[PDB]
């Protein structure tokens, strides 16, 4: 008896599940994935050997910062977009928190000036946007003409000649450019008339109206669609040219077609390189690469190989197709080392000289190399098909964290997504479209807020706790509708397009064997409602 | 020469393949599945250990029984449904196998009496349904007003306060309720006027017209859409509160965030629990759980660990999230035990005391735990996407037997499929739609019978020997059509929407390597028919 009371009480404990607002990616960050390849046959390759490897790639040293965009929307009917001039940004937006009702635009190649409801030039205060996230803040004058101001993420990568905005647009000027001595030599594609730098600038929040306590240097630039501004800072000091990307526990090397070919079970890729080592020591002044390669190789050897294998010699270095560098240390198993010892009684130099020993090894290791290659093609084929069906799930599973993703052709675009606490989400009582009697929503409508005191935002329940801003998933209202949707650890049950109750995850049967089901399943018999 | 004669002769031996009628699930049985989770990083977790585990879950002891539904269909044009009163069930249906032509219904909130073809009240005989399965047998008076009687499966689970019908409808009354001394205390939500119990009831089959040789107690209940009746029997005696769900061959336990986290390669669920054991012996009177936990742990240890590991101590017990209880016995491998021996000379209590030994173990086992977690997320991601494309195949593969399945939102509904012998199936000579010349059926039309002398039922050939009752898969007729469909341990070939012949599975080429195909494939050349 009593045990059921304890179980009933424990069944109240819900998982720490949360909702996520995953906005659509703009293409500011795209990532590739591997394609299945023509796998080689076992007779191919020579001089097979096993060893430890450490793969490095070009260190691009990303520099993330925040930029503010300012622009005017114009509708006259005839839709247009225009940048805010520096004088309006400094003397009205930053100084007072207002924009001019006037907006210059172009129609039939001639300049024209628009106004709010054809009224005279007047100052208008900006109000924070309703749907905007706590991080990606924004403000606007309305809700004709409308003044808009938005704070967005920006990224620049080595050599820092350009930066990309969270909107997917590029700016062909260095984030470090400026009139300051060490900065007037940085890259810029724009005429001097399109750029302005303000020393001793003091910001003013469009929300709290609080003016900044300390001065900064602000850069401003006029693009034909909007003006961009960001806080200038001196360039970051230099760093190592390559970064340690992967530490492989085991890696087979073989000569094939006059080039080395590297492969392992873990790494889905295979590296092709020349038979000549790269002269790393001449360029790696200070041992950025040497120190890490030696440390990682010894650590991996100690962790496993120490009791069963022997090192052939000192680590080697090779450059492969793409941006990669491979540090490598070939190994010999104790059982194989004994063969070289006995054949010597008739030491790196011996390895590929004993044709009778190597003939066995070429087949013995070739067996493994081909097995891994055929298996990786099978996994890639399945994973690449699933990626097209649900890029959000495959991207999140690949990365190990929730991310938003789009398929953007043959390359995947990705973005971070915002978590929302489960107590800030409310589910609406009906799934029917009030204005279109024959149509119903396919998934539940919801109302939520990013923060405990924020305004309620209308959305729709996506898959696996995702919250969508667009109430656009629709269906014809078919009869006999019953559905269970995932909602904050538990489920939410809808019957005939009407909300009824919430279930805990323990209220639904979990399957494992036919024995579990033979005692529960029934021969279902449809009732065909009128 | 002669070998081909033997091969040709053996090629006649077809497999023991069968057809299956998979009716659509009604939602009377729904099952959940795992969702990929946040995989922890190797630096997390402490006090890692390996051990044997036995997982138990709450025993709901399902009680399956047979119930009969009685109702009247009314069409006046204006469609309605009504229950058959007890007097009609006892005095006409069971007594004589007939229903009244009359039926009470409600229109515009007023009671009205319908009549079959506007004729006077008269008795109508019940005739067996054409399409009904041997198990879900049923009868009706026609083929206005129509009397219907159907025998369906019903299920009740602990505490047995309600039951669900194969139609997906619930009945808020205990199957054990009745006027008897030990039964009038059971649960019921309905007024006394809606229930009737008949002692000394003698059933009469609506088919054979034979009256039963022994008396029974029959319960009858009037729901606003049908009356339900079932044979009453005294409540089943009590059973153990938990059932042994899983025997886990190897289970890693680790402390993380002030809670134990369990994981294995096989069990896709990572159980979470408090650091304190449960007082099982205080509630497990008669050792329902203890006896099985001890027996299983010893059996699994003897089967493998017997010669390579040492038991730390007596089995422990922990209650986890959801309805689970975990019995656990931590182990130490012989090689690890020696490390504790050599440090002690300077027993269970020692395990987490030698910091330098545990630091090595935390990394060693942490490596494995993270590897399993990342692997399981990859498998779940692929399996969950495939489930949406073909729930019948994935439910059947998960269960290990043919089942009918439907996606019902974010939870899968399931039911049993009815097997049909291959000699009882016939394929129709054409797949063109006679009444709609521009359209053709997507898959072959068929005729079959569940039993060797039963009437022929018209249907359509589904995927992998499934037989569908609705001829609804359609396409526009296109020139150059050629198709091979799976049909009873072989194939059936259709050309230009017409049936031609049957093939054995041996008449088609099986692929294994490119060598098999390089000698067979051609550079196909399209002939573009007129």
């Amino acid at each position, epitope marked *: 008896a009593t045990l059921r009371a304890h179980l009933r009480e424990i069944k*109240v404990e819900n998982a720490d599940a949360q909702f996520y607002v995953c906005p659509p990616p703009t293409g500011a960050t795209v990532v590739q994935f591997e394609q299945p390849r023509r796998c080689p046959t076992r007779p191919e390759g020579q001089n097979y050997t096993e060893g430890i490897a450490v793969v490095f790639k070009e260190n691009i040293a990303p520099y993330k910062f925040k930029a503010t965009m300012y622009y005017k929307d114009v509708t006259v009917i005839f839709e247009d977009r225009a940048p805010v001039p520096f004088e309006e940004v400094i003397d009205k937006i930053n100084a007072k928190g207002v924009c001019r009702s006037t907006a210059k635009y172009v129609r039939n190649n001639m300049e024209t000036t628009a106004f709010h409801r054809d009224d005279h030039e007047t100052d208008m205060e900006l109000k924070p946007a309703k749907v905007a996230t706590r991080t990606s803040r924004g403000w606007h004058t309305t809700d004709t003409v409308n003044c808009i101001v938005e704070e967005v993420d920006a990224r620049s990568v080595y050599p820092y000649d350009e930066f990309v905005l969270a909107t997917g647009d590029f700016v062909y000027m260095s984030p470090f450019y400026g009139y300051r001595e060490g900065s007037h030599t940085e890259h810029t594609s724009y005429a001097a008339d399109r750029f302005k730098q303000v020393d001793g600038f003091y910001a003013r929040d469009l929300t709290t109206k609080a003016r900044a306590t300390s001065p900064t240097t602000r850069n401003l630039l006029t693009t034909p669609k909007f003006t961009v501004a960001w806080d200038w800072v001196p360039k970051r000091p230099a760093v190592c040219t390559m970064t340690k990307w992967q530490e492989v526990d085991e890696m087979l090397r073989a000569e094939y077609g006059g080039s080395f070919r590297f492969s392992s079970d873990a790494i889905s890729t295979t590296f092709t390189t020349n038979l000549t080592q790269y002269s790393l020591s001449r360029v790696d002044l200070g041992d950025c690469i040497g120190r890490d390669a030696r440390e990682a190789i010894d650590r991996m050897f100690a962790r496993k190989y120490n009791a069963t294998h022997i090192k052939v010699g000192q680590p080697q270095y090779y450059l492969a197709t793409g941006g990669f560098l491979i540090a490598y240390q070939p190994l010999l198993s104790n059982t194989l080392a004994e063969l070289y010892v006995r054949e010597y009684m008739r030491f790196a130099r011996l390895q590929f000289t004993y044709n009778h020993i190597q003939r066995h090894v070429n087949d013995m290791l070739g067996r493994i190399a081909v097995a891994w290659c055929e298996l990786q093609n099978h996994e890639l084929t399945l994973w690449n098909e699933a990626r097209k069906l649900n890029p959000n799930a495959i991207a999140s599973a690949t990365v190990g964290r929730r991310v938003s993703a789009r398929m953007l052709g043959d390359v995947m675009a990705v973005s971070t997504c915002v978590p929302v606490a489960p107590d800030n989400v*409310i589910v609406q*009582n009906s799934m029917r479209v009030s204005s279109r009697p024959g149509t119903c929503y396919s998934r539940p409508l919801v109302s939520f807020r990013y923060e405990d005191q924020g305004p309620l935002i209308e959305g729709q329940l996506g898959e696996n706790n995702e919250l969508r801003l667009t109430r656009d998933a629709l269906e014809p209202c078919t009869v006999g509708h019953r559905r269970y949707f995932i909602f904050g650890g538990g489920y939410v*049950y809808f*019957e005939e397009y*009407a*909300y*009824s*109750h*919430q*279930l*805990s995850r323990a*209220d639904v049967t979990t399957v494992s064997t036919f024995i579990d089901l033979n005692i529960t399943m029934l021969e279902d018999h449809e009732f065909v409602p009128l | 020469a002669t070998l081909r004669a033997h091969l040709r002769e053996i090629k006649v031996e077809n497999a023991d393949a069968q057809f299956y009628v998979c009716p659509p699930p009604t939602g009377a049985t729904v099952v959940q599945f795992e969702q990929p989770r946040r995989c922890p990083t190797r630096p997390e977790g402490q006090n890692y250990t390996e051990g044997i585990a036995v997982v138990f879950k709450e025993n709901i002891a399902p009680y399956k029984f047979k119930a009969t539904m009685y109702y009247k269909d009314v069409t006046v044009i204006f469609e309605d449904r009504a229950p058959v009163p007890f007097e009609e069930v006892i005095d006409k249906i069971n007594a004589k196998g007939v229903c009244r032509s009359t039926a009470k219904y409600v229109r515009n909130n007023m009671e009205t009496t319908a009549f079959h073809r506007d004729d006077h009240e008269t008795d109508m005989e019940l005739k067996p349904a054409k399409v009904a399965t041997r198990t879900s047998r049923g009868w009706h008076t026609t083929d206005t007003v129509n009397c219907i009687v159907e025998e369906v499966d019903a299920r009740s*689970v602990y505490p047995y*306060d*309600e039951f*669900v019908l194969a139609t997906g409808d*619930f009945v*808020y009354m205990s199957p054990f309720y009745g006027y008897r001394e030990g039964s009038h*205390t059971e649960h*019921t*939500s*309905y*007024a*006394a006027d*809606r229930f009737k119990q008949v002692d000394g009831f003698y059933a009469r089959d609506l088919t054979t017209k034979a009256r039963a040789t022994s008396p029974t107690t029959r319960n009858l209940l009037t*729901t*606003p859409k049908f009356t339900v009746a079932w044979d009453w029997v005294p409540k089943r005696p009590a059973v153990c509160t938990m059932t042994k769900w899983q025997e886990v061959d190897e289970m890693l336990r680790a402390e993380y965030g002030g809670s134990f986290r369990f994981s294995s390669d096989a069990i896709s669920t990572t159980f979470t629990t408090n650091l304190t054991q449960y007082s099982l012996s205080r509630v497990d009177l008669g050792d329902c759980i203890g006896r099985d936990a001890r027996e299983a742990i010893d059996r699994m240890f003897a089967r493998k660990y017997n010669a390579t590991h040492i038991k730390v101590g007596q089995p422990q017990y922990y209650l986890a999230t959801g309805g689970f209880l975990i019995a656990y016995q931590p182990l130490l491998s012989n090689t690890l035990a020696e490390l504790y021996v050599r440090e002690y000379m300077r027993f269970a209590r020692l395990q987490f005391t030698y910091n330098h030994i545990q630091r090595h173990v935390n990394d060693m086992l942490g490596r494995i735990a993270v590897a399993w977690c990342e692997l399981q997320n990859h498998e779940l991601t692929l399996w969950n996407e495939a489930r949406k494309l073909n729930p019948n195949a994935i439910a059947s593969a998960t269960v290990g037997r043919r089942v009918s399945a439907r996606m019902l939102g974010d939870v899968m509904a399931v039911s049993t499929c009815v097997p049909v012998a291959p000699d009882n199936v016939i394929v129709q000579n054409s797949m063109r739609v006679s009444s709609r010349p521009g359209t053709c059926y997507s898959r072959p039309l068929v005729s079959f019978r569940y039993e060797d002398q039963g009437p022929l039922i018209e249907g359509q050939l589904g995927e992998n020997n499934e037989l569908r009752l609705t001829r609804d898969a359609l396409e526009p007729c296109t020139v150059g059509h050629r198709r091979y469909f799976i049909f009873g341990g072989g194939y059936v070939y259709f050309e230009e929407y017409a049936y031609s012949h049957q093939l054995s599975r041996a008449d088609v080429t099986t692929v294994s390597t490119f060598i098999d195909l390089n000698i067979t494939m051609l550079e196909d050349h399209e002939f573009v028919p007129l």
Partner: nanobody
Amino acid sequence: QVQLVESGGGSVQPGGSLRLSCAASASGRLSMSGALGWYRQVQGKSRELVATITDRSSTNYADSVKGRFTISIDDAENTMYLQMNSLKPEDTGVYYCNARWRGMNVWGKGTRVTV
């Protein structure tokens, strides 16, 4: 999880009237419940059926109560009420609200009524 907060109990002389109420948390919508109702305990008996709504439009009452009491619901407030008119001394006991959705079941902490 669903919570049923019950209120409206007390004491009145014979021939008086009362109104019990049972409000539910957002996690369980009463208008969609498969069976809603009030059950009474008496010193020498188990839970008697008092009044229920066994389908979204059906109704049930005890023989000894039919005509005096009335059950109703409010979908906006997510609350159900039991209007009790012309009480008798026999109506004394502990009343418990119950609501159940497709196999999930919930009981309120019973309120006392005495005459």
